[PDB]
């Protein structure tokens, strides 16, 4: 996953997580407004190993952490079909599960029996169970750490974003928090891509100074 | 090259595929260094790279350096041009006081020749009468100082009588300004000949790195004088636009029109050959 | 085709 | 200013606040403009501002860049307040025959002892010897040209009496690629001493354009034809590689024991404070 | 307005354009989660000058510069219920409209009387003659410093917002462009508080030092 754009020499490659440092106000934000209007403009290309350029709807943009939406449609569809692997993953208490619907389900059909009225059903299975409880992530009271952390447990769920970016988020993290957010994405293996106007001490980053000159920066 | 680039803006230069890179935060433009004779940098906000600085040493290209007041500061010197100037040396150091003092008399006169053309293309016959006079009086060695009472009836006589060259208007400004700009593009072709350019052809005992490329930069001086003449009721930026419109325009020489630049090169390398032969022509140059 | 190029103000 | 600022690694260059802010990857440090004599630029990775040139050109240091073969390319020539070493280019040029023949008759020696010396390392007493009656036999003017007979003696010494330099082989092309590192670094020395190197010391053959500095470090030449002969099996890159070490190990000056490139800027300036003062004492070598 | 927390010794007021510089980083991201969940939590209170709470809905919180709509429901909503307003104020104006949509009505009427199949209408109303033209704001915006502006012009148009705050969004804008937007917001009246984690050279502002005393700046 390299990204390359006119100021830069060679394009740039993004693996795990990549903290990228713009020192110049202006290419940092005429940067940014190249990220938002990607499919428009040409000067920004990102492209993978095959190096075939990727299409904003495969890109993942995010500024305000607070105010995106991590609860979708695909997200708790795709979270309940992974609570489900992970209930079929244990035989015993699938086996539980099954008795205790079995039960319900005897219950209920004995109801309908009482009936005068000639009823019909089917199952009642533990995807239904599932969105009957309504699983959910909880964003309202997470701390804008959590938020992201959360954040980069659901990128493996969404299907069609090849990358993720964030715009100035590492002002907010301490610097340790910052070293479980990088250590977190190593092992979830996504691309992440920071940008930030002023570099941060300790972390490993590509600094680009108002010279226009890239350099890696091991602090 | 043909071209005279000129970076008043903050911005990037590097070197890439035999290509100078301008990288700024507007836009990006990259211009062949072939196409490129001068590089002028205007502003002390520019940053460039040590990879594109050496390129333009191979690639012989002067490059500029000017302050905060857009006034030129330093220029680059490479130490080798060409494998003739270790040659070149030699016959340096062994040159002739009669082939110095012959050739910068007749570059004297060709001045002053130039000086009283321009006063003749100016309608003053008196005033090119006389500096006819002083051309037709100069004798080596110098000792009527006819260059110098020259010059200070032709300055005397288009800027006025109160006026003069130590005082500190625009006018002596914009003068140093494209004496030195002249003097910068006279010492680079005599960087470009490979002979020593501390060493006058005049005066023995005055010690300077410009002495040489002011004598042969001589004659050219009426060139900046005329817009300076015609631009001096104009602020001192556009009489520096003028002067940068002269690098644009053409002049006649003996043979045919051709570019300033062509005729600086092929004027300081037949004053070279005929320095090395012993006078074997003078190059005349007329406006 | 031109001998003066400007990169900066156009003055 | 005292300390000479050389930068052989990447970094960038900045002026804040009458200090020169130097950046590399590693580490950043300041240094005071008054701290500061001449700067040298190693590598064509080295990032500078114009700034710090209008600053270094109000502060007078000499600014020197060089290529990727390190061999200095051009240098900043100011205006005005110009430097010494301009003024002390003149006396190179005043430099007496006699002195330069002293200096060349006292190099030759001392290659040739450190030939004959090596020879005696290598536990050849006869070529040794020999080697080193044609040290005491050498004259001036060179009328017996006892060094190219010690030449062959030398190389015959080392690699056979097959071997030769005229031939092609990884071996004289490692000699070559040895002289062309000290070459380089004589260079370097010779080039912030300020005077040219295109006057040489000997004064048969000006051929070559480092002569000044190909006549400098010829005594310090058999340390490349040790290392040379005890690789000489290897490979022309493994000979590559093990000349390259010769930077990181450190040799015995004879004062103390010192890093190469210390001991030839000690030599470099010895010498030119020799040649500038005629002859007050001679830098002696010795392997 | 001012705005007031337990760090603070007493409430400082937000007036025009205003700069809050917060140099502990756990006290920024707590402030910002105190801002998104200011109506979950009664940490964070604003207090106007008449000395009264005001509800979250009053309070617009906006973080992204790019990525927040100009375009709503509810702004379309007011924008087209202004221009039906204006439209209301001149009764001629008006009755031409009515006139040409009677007109309109009746060609397309005769058109339908022309087919074979039966057709039924109801009216063509002037909310629908804006809707059917897409009225909305200026959507073109070629960089941040444009967008700052539209949001600063929609803010200045809303009424029930009281009060707008950005979340580090000094960071894209040059000194100068900084300069050129306090003065715009002392030209437009309204107040706007910017929240950033380290201080910014050359202008006015409260810095809040990690020993949590408040001082001003410039
Ligand atoms: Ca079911
Ligand atoms: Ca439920």
Redesign the pocket.
Known sequence: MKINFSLLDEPMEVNLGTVLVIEDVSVFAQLVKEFYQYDEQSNLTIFDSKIRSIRSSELLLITDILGYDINTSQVLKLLHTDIVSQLNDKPEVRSEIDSLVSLITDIIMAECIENELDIEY????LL?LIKALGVRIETKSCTVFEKIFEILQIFKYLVKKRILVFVNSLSYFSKDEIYQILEYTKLSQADVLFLEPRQIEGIQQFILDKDYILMPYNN | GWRTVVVNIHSKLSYKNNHLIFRNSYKTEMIHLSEIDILLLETTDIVLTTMLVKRLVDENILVIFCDDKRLPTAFLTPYYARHDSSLQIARQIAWKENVKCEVWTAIIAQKILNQSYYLGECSFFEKSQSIMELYHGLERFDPSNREGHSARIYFNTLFGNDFTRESDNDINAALDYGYTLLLSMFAREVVVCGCMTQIGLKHANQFNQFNLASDIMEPFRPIIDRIVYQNRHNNFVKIKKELFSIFSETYLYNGKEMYLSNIVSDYTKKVIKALNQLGEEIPEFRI | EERLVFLGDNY
């Open positions: 089917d199952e009642i299975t239904e």
